[PDB]
């Protein structure tokens, strides 16, 4: 069997590999190279431009933490936007909240949605919910144009190389601020603390120009490089996102596999060297 | 440049690679294959039997968490044992406590010590401290023979394939229990929660046959497989190891890079699926 290897100028000198059971699908979409393969030990794997987006084995860690952190802090979230997230894992976690009335997703690449609906049925199931509305367009444009404001925006983008290159700058954060309710929250996937701390500092400084309270949390996920990934956390009130306002007790949450009330606050307890780098921003 | 790749029957289907700047030393010792190379981005790297033991870039995360968790909980630790740990990183963190009167290390492979003294001088500096006494022998035998009891034992072993195969069974845990003071603590490196949960359950069940309080904590370290590693935590009193009894304020601790008073308790907040697997042991 051959191995897939994740190599990138974004983390030089290191690489993670998974063994391939079977390649399932490859295409060059309008935006990205798309690869779906069944791995031998992590189930199916989605790859965009040679970078792992998810595997069936660990995706719940990332989709649960990114969704339930801001959604247990928002008191009565009615309108949620997902930026990127074509695979549908965030939407899947959002549909669990009976209270939500509308879930918009702006995903630039409809191939990713259609690929997820075919090959990742337990991730893309949320697309069946009549509350979900899909916009195929660059979130950088959508956020300039949208009329509605949201209670929560979840930026589930791929990396800065490729069509996500527009989601990693000061302008983008102003657009997010303006599209949120006066008490609304944004979480965004953010750089592994083991890799470019300079990037984390840059993003934090972007968010801090607008938001009252900017926190960084860390998630353990093994198929992202360095085995972890950050959440950049943006709040308009001084109270921030470290402390949930509700517990997930109803039947729709029974099945959760990573996220719980205590993990929520714990994700925000960072390594000493990280606190020192981001103390004077 | 060539790449070093970490492949193992202990985590099939996956592999982590580092690019090689220069190989520095290789030998077949009495026990293991030993490889020291300077990587392009993680500094020098120590490899035993094809498995990464440390790199200069991230070793502090593991050596700080394994040492300072039990050493901030022990009230006045006077005698500490390190099992394995030939590289000296634990001893380096131990020497920081002025109070400690004696530090014994039982390392089966003296080549690892001598290699660390030559090629890893900022890790092996602790060997110069007149409080440190080295025993070259299998810890499985040493723990049967030692007369002293310790306030803290830190099991810093390599993996179950190779000479560490004796440190992963019920007998080993009884030896640890007997070598500890009535209020003494043991921490042991323990399986990544992303890989063999069955192993974690087995080890927990071993420790629980003897110890009042058996906790599992997780450390983020990118050059261990799946980017994290557990600490099996064994206490003879019901109070356990999640809560430090002291803060590290004196000048010897100024330089700490991962471990702080809040990270300590946070390491013990685990993923939902892990708590569910280890609730009925
Ligand atoms: C797989 S989840 C990440 C998704 O982010 C999507 N994405 C990347 N860049 C953008 C963008 N500028 N706007 C909307 N979605 C994006 C990618 O096409 C991918 O499907
Ligand atoms: C590099 S730190 C881990 C150390 O554990 C040491 N080690 C492995 N098995 C044993 C054992 N049975 N007793 C003492 N040390 C051990 C290895 O030789 C290695 O240097
Ligand atoms: N919805 C899963 C996609 C997650 N987005 C990113 C994939 C690329 C990774 N290096 C970081 C997160
Ligand atoms: N003192 C550093 C050695 C750490 N012991 C182990 C090395 C092998 C890893 N897979 C797990 C920890």
TrEMBL record, chains A, B:
Keywords: Polyamine biosynthesis, Transferase. It comes from the Eukaryota. GO terms for biological process: spermidine biosynthetic process. HAMAP family: Spermidine_synth. The active site is at 156 (proton acceptor). One of its GO terms (cellular component) is cytosol. CDD domains: AdoMet_MTases (cd02440). Spermidine binds at residue 156. The keyword Transferase applies. Belongs to the spermidine/spermine synthase family. It comes from Plasmodium falciparum (isolate 3D7). This is Spermidine synthase. It is an enzyme of class 2 (transferase). GO terms for molecular function: spermidine synthase activity. InterPro entries: PABS (IPR030374), PABS_CS (IPR030373), SAM-dependent_MTases_sf (IPR029063), Spermi_synthase (IPR001045), Spermidine_synt_N (IPR035246), Spermidine_synt_N_sf (IPR037163). SUPFAM superfamilies: S-adenosyl-L-methionine-dependent methyltransferases (SSF53335). Residues 1-236 form the PABS domain. PROSITE patterns: PABS_1 (PS01330), PABS_2 (PS51006). Its EC number is 2.5.1.16. Gene3D superfamilies: Spermidine synthase, tetramerisation domain, Vaccinia Virus protein VP39.
């Amino acid at each position: 069997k051959k191995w897939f290897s994740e190599f990138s100028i974004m983390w030089p000198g290191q690489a993670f590999s998974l063994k391939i059971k079977k390649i399932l699908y490859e295409t060059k979409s309008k935006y990205q190279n798309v690869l779906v393969f069944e791995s031998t030990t992590y189930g199916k794997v989605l790859v965009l431009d040679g970078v792992i987006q998810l595997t069936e084995k660990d995706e719940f860690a990332y989709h649960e933490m990114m969704t339930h952190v801001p959604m247990t802090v928002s008191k009565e979230p009615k309108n949620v936007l997902v930026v990127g997230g074509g695979d549908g894992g965030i939407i899947r976690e959002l549909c669990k909240y009976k209270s939500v009335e509308n879930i918009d997703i702006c995903e630039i690449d409809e191939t990713v949605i259609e690929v997820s609906k075919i090959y990742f049925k337990n991730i893309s199931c949320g697309y069946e919910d009549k509350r979900v509305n899909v916009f195929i367009e660059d979130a950088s444009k959508f956020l300039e144009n949208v009329t509605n404001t949201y209670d929560v925006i979840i930026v589930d983008s791929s990396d800065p190389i490729g069509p996500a290159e527009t989601l990693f700058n000061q302008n983008f954060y102003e657009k997010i601020y303006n599209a949120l309710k006066p008490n609304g929250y944004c979480v965004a996937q953010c750089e592994s603390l083991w890799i470019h701390v300079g990037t984390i500092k840059n993003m934090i400084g972007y968010a801090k120009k607008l938001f009252k309270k900017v926190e960084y949390a860390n998630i353990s996920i093994p198929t992202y490089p360095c085995g972890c990934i950050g959440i950049l956390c943006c709040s308009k009130t001084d109270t921030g996102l470290t402390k949930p306002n509700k517990k997930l007790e109803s039947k729709e949450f029974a099945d959760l596999k990573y996220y719980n009330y205590e993990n929520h606050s714990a994700a925000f307890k960072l390594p000493a060297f990280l606190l020192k780098e981001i103390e004077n921003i």
